[PDB]
Design a protein around this ligand. Structure first.
Ligand SMILES: Nc1ncnc2c1ncn2[C@@H]1O[C@H](CSCC[C@H](N)C(=O)O)[C@@H](O)[C@H]1O
Ligand SMILES: Nc1ncnc2c1ncn2[C@@H]1O[C@H](CSCC[C@H](N)C(=O)O)[C@@H](O)[C@H]1O
Ligand SMILES: [Zn+2]
Ligand SMILES: [Zn+2]
Lengths: 357, 333, 153
């Protein structure tokens, strides 16, 4: 309400368009020894310190979850995107590409991302179950599908009568306080009777659900060709912030789409299984945009997502991919995204192979 | 909490059977029968030239017994105001009391002599017995039904007689704790149930249940239902009374012109009402079927009511914030 | 004093501290019945604590019923809706010069919107605070203050 000037918080200011290329002037270059963060190349220890795990569900206490179309991710220093070699005779040959950052994820495996949960959403990493207290809420996994066919599961550990979880997929723009299907960008199942919920509309084109159901979830979206028919460029936003005691990265998320025309992604579908037994097709009409597996809680619902290598009734398809596979695929993809952005800003020129892949 | 300018020299008041009228005595010796609903005086009776210090309604409400300071007792029809009967005694009368179940009969507590029970049909009188023969100051009262007579002396002795035979049906002396007696200031009963109270010279009100005295027999040790006092100020009580139901008890601190309100079962102090620091508290009464309390102080009457949450607070009124209970289909179509 | 203890005291004294009467500001409003000190708890805007996402569904609902919305934003996630269930705080007018101010407190985990006194408020005074209503395109104000914006918005 003042002017096109300094950011809304004096805690950290990013370089405005008039202060272009202003890197986040957060912590000073003068660091303390510390000792705990003095890991070297000879030691074998994961620098991403996961919090203490507790059998009772807990809350991430100092994480400002996504809002206003503003995505929030973990940050690590990464003082140099590694390009160190011998001192070449030409002192103007190589570029260090000092991004001084990375999207390192606080996860041993592809799990339910804590960055995209509601403040009323509790997790227990003993089974990575998710639970709530009042009404409905939504959580999502770490990964997100953009093409191909894949598959995961949800295991339900507690379903009292006043406890009805919902399980399915949701694109970004999905308000994580809504019950996973209240908008047109989410398609789920209600875990009282198998009922497909989308646009808050319930449809009985489905089988029946059981209290101890280990439910399999198969979903096939077309390649990014039929998804976009154009450039699927991924120019990323990256902003450095130093929240109360830790460094984090902000990126710009998508905006609420007013899409009211139906253009289904070609040959995309969703299939639901009960313990591998085909519960049937859920949604053939699938809108564009990346999707991610999501779970909605009612009052005190206990469910958990699960990947493929520890499966119970897996499909024997050679094309579908477990949660972990697409997870590390997207992780490596965002690594290359950081690489390319630091290249763009740091070294003149860019170049990519024969487009098709 | 609301006074009346239309009456002067208020000295003693008495509710009718249903708490609709209030007969107040005045220093001129007049009865002012004032109405609650119309909030106006209903009748004026030239009772005595002498102020009236004792007033009681009849059960039908058509008779009022009045006692002048001239030792002149007189019965008056409330519709006409005529002196139905008139009697005079020695040892000026301290109190009169219609019999609750026989308005023909009326007990009278005089100053120095024993209380005597008279009838209106026949101008006879039955002198009630006195234990110690030397009290010279014994208050007496009918019970709720008029079946027994409770007489308390200046020496803490308490006799329960039967109203018809005057035979000693129970007895006990109250204690000051250690070993001493105390002047029985007054005996009050509940219009509902059987709990009654005693105001004594120790400034300590003692609440009992008459059945326990009856089963205690003569010369026993009945404990009170409750013991009530101002542990803070140690204030005497000029006049006390139950609530209409009998679960609230009020005492009038004439020392500081205040009103203490305790409960019956627990006995904890409900509240305190403060009057004009310059007013001398004289008389206290409770509305028999309302949380309304009449006070007579320095010849002026004040009214103390108690209202509910409504009269402006009645959407659906709530007191504290309510977390909405979201449903399963709360977002469903 | 502890916010819980202060809140208990406020909920005990609220019924006898304030009243509602005919108001020269507009219609009926909240007046002071006992001299209120500065910063002390005047009144809770008690009501139905709901989440923000359910506001519109309620609002349109009231819009379908012709019943005025009595909602105050607790925060970006919660709202006290007093349209159907509330307290006397639904009769606090606004003044550009308020002797009161709204603050959100946390008691035992639940948030309460309490109007406290910006200054020492005396008996008979009408209670008013800053609604801080965003600028629309116009509600005239009759608060009587010399600094009055002529419009809440
Ligand atoms: N300061 C002010 N200036 C102009 N209008 C005001 C006002 N304060 C309150 N109002 C009006 O009064 C209404 C209060 S809703 C209460 C209705 C009415 N006063 C009653 O007591 O029944 C609002 O809708 C608003 O339009
Ligand atoms: N300065 C102002 N101008 C116009 N309306 C106002 C106002 N201040 C308060 N209001 C009214 O206050 C209401 C919201 S809260 C209601 C409090 C109001 N005193 C009452 O008696 O109901 C609105 O409907 C609006 O009509
Ligand atoms: Zn104003
Ligand atoms: Zn104003």
């Amino acid at each position: 309400k003042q002017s096109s000037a300094v950011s809304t918080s004096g805690n950290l200011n990013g370089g405005i368009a008039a202060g272009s290329s202003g890197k986040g002037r957060g912590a000073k270059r003068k660091q303390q020894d510390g000792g705990t963060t003095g890991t070297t190349k000879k030691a074998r220890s994961d620098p991403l310190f996961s919090a203490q795990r507790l059998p009772p569900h807990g809350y991430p206490l100092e994480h400002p979850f996504n809002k206003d179309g503003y995505r929030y991710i973990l940050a690590e220093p990464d003082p140099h995107a590694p390009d160190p070699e011998k001192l070449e005779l030409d002192c103007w040959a190589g570029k260090p590409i000092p991004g001084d950052l990375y999207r390192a994820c606080l996860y041993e495996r592809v799990l339910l991302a804590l960055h995209d949960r509601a403040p009323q959403l509790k997790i227990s990493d003993d089974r990575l179950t998710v639970v709530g207290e009042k009404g409905y809420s939504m959580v999502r996994a770490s990964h997100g599908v953009r093409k191909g066919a894949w598959y995961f599961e949800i295991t339900v550990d507690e379903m009292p009568p006043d406890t009805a979880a919902r399980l399915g997929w949701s694109q970004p723009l999905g308000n994580l306080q809504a019950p996973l299907g209240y908008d047109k960008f989410s398609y789920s199942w209600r875990s009282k009777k198998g009922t497909k919920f989308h646009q808050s509309i319930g449809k009985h084109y489905s089988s029946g659900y059981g209290q101890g159901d280990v439910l399999g979830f198969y979903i096939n979206l077309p390649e990014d060709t039929e998804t976009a028919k154009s450039l699927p460029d991924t120019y990323k936003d990256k902003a450095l912030i130093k929240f109360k005691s830790y460094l984090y990265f902000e990126e710009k998320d998508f905006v609420d789409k007013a899409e009211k025309s139906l253009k289904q992604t070609p040959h995309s579908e969703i299939i639901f299984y009960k313990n591998g037994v085909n519960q049937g097709v859920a949604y053939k009409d699938i809108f564009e945009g990346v999707y991610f597996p999501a779970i909605s809680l009612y009052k005190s619902c206990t469910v958990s997502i699960n990947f493929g290598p520890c499966f119970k009734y897996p499909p024997k398809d050679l094309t579908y991919r477990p949660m972990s596979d697409m997870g590390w695929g997207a992780v490596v993809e965002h690594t290359l995204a950081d690489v390319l952005y630091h290249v763009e800003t740091e070294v003149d020129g860019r170049r990519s192979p024969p487009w098709e892949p | 909490d609301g006074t009346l300018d239309c009456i002067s020299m208020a000295l003693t008041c008495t509710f009718n059977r249903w708490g609709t009228l209030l007969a107040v005595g005045c220093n001129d010796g007049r009865i002012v029968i004032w109405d609650f609903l119309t909030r106006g005086i209903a009748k004026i009776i030239s009772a005595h030239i002498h102020p009236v210090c004792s007033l009681c309604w009849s059960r039908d409400g058509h008779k009022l017994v009045s006692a002048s300071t001239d030792n002149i007792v007189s019965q008056w029809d409330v519709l006409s105001g005529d002196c139905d009967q008139r009697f005079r005694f020695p040892s000026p009368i301290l109190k009169v009391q219609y019999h609750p179940r026989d308005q023909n009969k009326v007990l009278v507590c005089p100053m120095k002599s024993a209380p005597v029970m008279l009838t209106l049909s026949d101008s006879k009188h039955v002198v009630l017995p006195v234990d110690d023969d030397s009290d010279l100051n014994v208050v007496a009262s009918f019970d709720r039904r008029g079946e027994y007579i409770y007489t308390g002396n200046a020496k803490g002795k308490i006799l329960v007689l039967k109203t018809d035979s005057q035979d000693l049906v129970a007895s006990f002396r109250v204690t000051t704790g250690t070993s001493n007696t105390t002047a029985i200031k007054s005996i009050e009963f509940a219009r509902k149930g059987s709990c009654f109270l005693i105001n004594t010279a120790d400034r300590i009100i003692r609440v009992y249940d008459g059945r326990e005295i009856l089963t205690c027999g003569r010369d026993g040790e009945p404990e009170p239902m409750q013991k009530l006092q101002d542990l803070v100020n140690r204030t005497p009580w000029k006049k006390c009374c139950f609530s209409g139901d009998g679960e609230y008890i009020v005492a009038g601190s004439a020392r500081q012109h205040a009103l203490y309100i305790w409960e019956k079962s627990i006995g904890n102090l409900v509240k305190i009402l403060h009057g004009t620091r310059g007013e001398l508290l004289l008389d206290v009464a409770w509305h028999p079927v309302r949380p309304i309390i009449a006070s007579i102080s320095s010849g002026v009457v004040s009214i103390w009511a108690q209202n509910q949450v409504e009269n402006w607070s009645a959407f659906k009124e709530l007191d504290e914030n309510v977390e909405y209970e979201e449903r399963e289909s709360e977002f469903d179509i | 004093l502890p916010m819980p203890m202060r809140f208990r005291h406020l909920k005990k004294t609220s019924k006898e501290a304030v009243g509602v009467y005919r108001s020269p500001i507009h219609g009926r409003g909240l007046f002071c019945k006992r001299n209120i000190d500065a910063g002390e708890m005047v009144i809770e805007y008690a009501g139905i604590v709901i989440r923000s996402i359910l506001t519109d569904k309620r609002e349109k609902y009231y819009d379908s019923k012709g019943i005025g919305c009595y909602m105050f934003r607790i925060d970006d996630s919660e709202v006290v809706d007093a349209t159907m269930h509330g307290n006397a705080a639904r009769f606090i007018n606004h003044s550009c010069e308020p002797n009161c101010y709204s603050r959100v407190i946390n008691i035992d985990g639940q948030k309460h919107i309490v109007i406290f006194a910006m200054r020492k408020i005396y008996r008979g005074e009408e209670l008013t605070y800053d609604y801080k209503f965003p600028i629309e395109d116009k509600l005239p104000c009759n608060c009587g203050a010399k600094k009055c914006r002529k419009f809440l918005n």
